[PDB]
Structure formats: structure tokens, C-alpha cells
């Protein structure tokens, strides 16, 4: 598990160089934005239970065959596991937003999720369709354009943290494809 | 294979939606840039041999164990395969630049390049050093004019460097 600081040391260890100079000036501007990243992880963890129950319900309203007899989200034992399967994905994305590096997402959650879901009979078309709803919710909460709740932040721009959290949620969908 | 225009058409057809007026306007901003994206790609492919050869020569001067006898790029078979692997990654980045979307990049270059090199014994740490050398050789070549109408292209050269960053974290 690497964070954003461990990545620039592994890259410098391959050539056996001391960290200094231009990549020390790229690191001082990563911490200048370090409060925006801390402001924005909090704006997702605070809304984490409504983000999941809206994404699972919105996957169901698009494909109501999942709640038919024989559907994958049919019984109460299987409905409670999709609500659990879908908030572990959101939990591991919030680790990657706090760390600033998608290493912990890629190996503790995504490595082998596709082979697991097509061994339990889980439709990977619908799992992509719930992950893409959680992508639209996380970009709305970070840019503070939710229609259901407006948070309080200092004034400024956080469109690079929205580009980063959309890249993590696009990977999740590309991995379980 | 999706470009940037087909990325939003495919996402609309999964819900059966017409494209809204705020999505056509975001797509015409890409047509508005247009000529400046075609000069990022023209500057990269017209210096493609110098980008790869100068980044390989600098890679072996930093990790000389790769061309030692018994190394992973000893024996011309393995040396010539190391050079076209660098030109493969530079080719698909220039594909992903002209499309505006990284779909052709991580579907048919990067999807399974971490576990290709792992099965061969190729050090994927050293491959990522070679992507980073071709990265800043290309962004130093993108933001110079040399017979080009002067303007601001910094939102496009930040997109080109993000494709190189996407290939770098994917092989290790």
C-alpha cells in the first residue's frame, strides 16, 4: 500500500537518487492542496449511508428484474448483501482519496472482484450501473452541487479532486467489467 | 473503441436518453480546440524515434544491470523487444490524445500489462521509469511553438501528461 509520498520515493529508488530539486517542489504543492483533500474526504464520509441506499435503489429502478422472483437482489438475504457489497466499494474509494493513490483500492478490493462476481452469479452489468451512480454523487458532493444538501466550505475551487475521484470510480467499473 | 463523442452517446443509451443541450455544448468545446489537439499529436509522432531512443539510452545509464549479461535486455532478441515496447506505449498515448478519451489506451495496451511483465520476469518498476522519461520529453516538445500560432494550450498538455501518468502506474 502506497500513498502519494511513497510513490515518489519508489520512483527515486529505482535510479538510486536522493529526493530533491524539482520533485521536492512538486511535493510542496501537493501539501498546499492538502486541506482541500481533507475538506473533501469529510464531505463523502458524512453522506456515506445515503450515497449507498440511493445508488442501490437507482440500480433497481432501472432494472426491476433484480427484485423479481429469481433476481439477484430478490430475497432479504441477498438484498442485505448488495447493500454491503456496495458500501465496501465506497469505503475503499475513500481510502484512495485520502491517500491520494489508488494502490489500496486496486489490490484489496479490485483484484479478483470480477472472477468472484461471475462465480456467485452476480450481474456485472448492474454492478457497473450502481458504481456509476456513486460516481455522480461524489462529484456533486465535492463540487458542492448536490440538490439535496449543501455543505459549508471555504471559498475556492476543487475541480482537481473531482477529476481524481471520478478516475477512481471509473476504474472500479472497468475492473469488474 | 470509444472516442470522446462516443463516450457520452454510449452512456446515454444505457438509460435511453437524448443528449441534452448542456452536453452538446461541452462537446463543441472539443471541436473548438480542435486544431490545437492535432498539433500535440503531430509534434509527438514526428519526433517518435528521438523520444524513444533518447529515453532508452538514459534508462540503461541509470540501471546498468538491465544490459549486463544475464540481464533482462541482454541478447538482441530481448533488446529489440524492449525498444518496441516503449514505442507501443507512445503509440497508444498518441491514439488516446487524438480521441480525447483513454479508451483505446487502457483496453488494448494497458489492460493486463502489469501481469504480462510479471509472468515474464520483466521489472515493471524499470518500465515505469521509461514512461516517465518519454513523458517529459513529450511535454517539453508540446509547449514550444517553432512555427505555430502562439496561444494557451496548457489544458491539453495537462491531458497528455495524464495519459503518460496512467500508463506509468499501470505497469508496476
Amino acid at each position: 500500500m502506497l500513498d502519494a509520498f511513497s510513490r515518489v520515493v519508489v520512483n527515486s529508488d529505482a535510479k538510486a537518487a536522493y529526493v530533491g530539486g524539482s520533485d521536492l517542489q512538486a511535493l510542496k504543492s501537493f501539501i498546499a492542496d492538502g486541506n482541500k483533500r481533507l475538506d473533501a474526504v469529510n464531505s463523502i464520509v458524512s453522506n456515506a449511508s445515503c450515497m449507498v441506499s440511493d445508488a442501490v435503489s437507482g440500480m433497481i429502478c432501472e432494472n426491476p428484474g433484480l427484485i423479481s422472483p429469481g433476481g439477484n437482489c430478490y430475497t432479504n438475504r441477498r438484498m442485505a448483501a448488495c447493500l454491503r457489497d456496495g458500501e465496501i466499494i465506497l469505503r475503499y474509494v475513500s481510502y484512495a482519496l485520502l491517500a491520494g493513490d489508488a494502490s489500496v483500492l486496486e489490490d484489496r478490493c479490485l483484484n479478483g472482484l470480477k472472477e468472484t462476481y461471475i462465480a456467485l452469479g452476480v450481474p456485472t452489468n448492474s454492478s457497473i450501473r450502481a458504481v456509476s451512480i456513486m460516481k455522480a454523487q461524489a462529484v456533486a458532493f465535492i463540487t458542492n452541487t448536490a440538490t439535496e444538501r449543501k455543505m459549508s466550505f471555504a471559498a475556492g475551487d476543487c475541480t482537481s479532486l473531482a477529476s481524481e475521484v471520478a478516475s477512481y470510480f471509473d476504474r472500479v467499473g472497468a475492473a469488474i467489467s | 473503441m470509444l472516442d470522446a463523442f462516443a463516450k457520452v452517446v454510449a452512456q446515454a443509451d444505457a438509460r435511453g436518453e437524448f443528449l441534452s443541450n448542456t452536453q452538446i455544448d461541452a462537446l463543441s468545446k472539443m471541436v473548438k480546440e480542435g486544431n490545437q489537439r492535432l498539433d500535440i499529436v503531430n509534434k509527438v509522432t514526428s519526433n517518435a524515434s528521438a523520444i524513444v531512443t533518447n529515453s532508452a539510452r538514459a534508462l540503461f545509464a541509470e540501471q546498468p544491470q538491465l544490459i549486463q549479461p544475464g540481464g533482462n535486455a541482454y541478447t538482441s532478441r530481448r533488446m529489440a523487444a524492449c525498444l518496441r515496447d516503449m514505442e507501443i506505449v507512445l503509440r497508444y498515448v498518441s491514439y488516446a490524445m487524438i480521441a480525447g478519451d483513454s479508451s483505446v489506451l487502457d483496453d488494448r495496451c494497458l489492460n493486463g500489462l502489469r501481469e504480462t511483465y510479471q509472468a515474464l520476469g520483466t521489472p515493471g518498476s524499470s518500465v515505469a521509469v521509461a514512461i516517465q522519461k518519454m513523458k517529459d520529453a513529450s511535454v517539453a516538445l508540446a509547449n514550444d511553438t517553432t512555427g505555430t500560432p502562439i496561444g494557451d494550450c496548457s489544458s491539453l498538455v495537462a491531458e497528455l501528461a495524464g495519459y503518460f501518468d496512467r500508463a506509468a502506474v499501470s505497469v508496476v
Binding site: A26, S29, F30, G100, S167, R171 | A158
Partner: peptide, 18 residues
């Protein structure tokens, strides 16, 4: 999939004068 530092060091180098 993104590098935050390597992309947080290039965006601050073209906007800020040297």
C-alpha cells in the same frame, strides 16, 4: 489510476511563473 503528485506538480508549473 492517476498520479496526484506528478499531476499536482505539472499544473502548478505552467500557471505559476518561474
Amino acid at each position: 489510476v492517476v498520479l496526484p503528485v506528478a499531476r499536482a506538480g505539472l499544473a502548478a508549473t505552467a500557471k505559476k511563473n518561474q
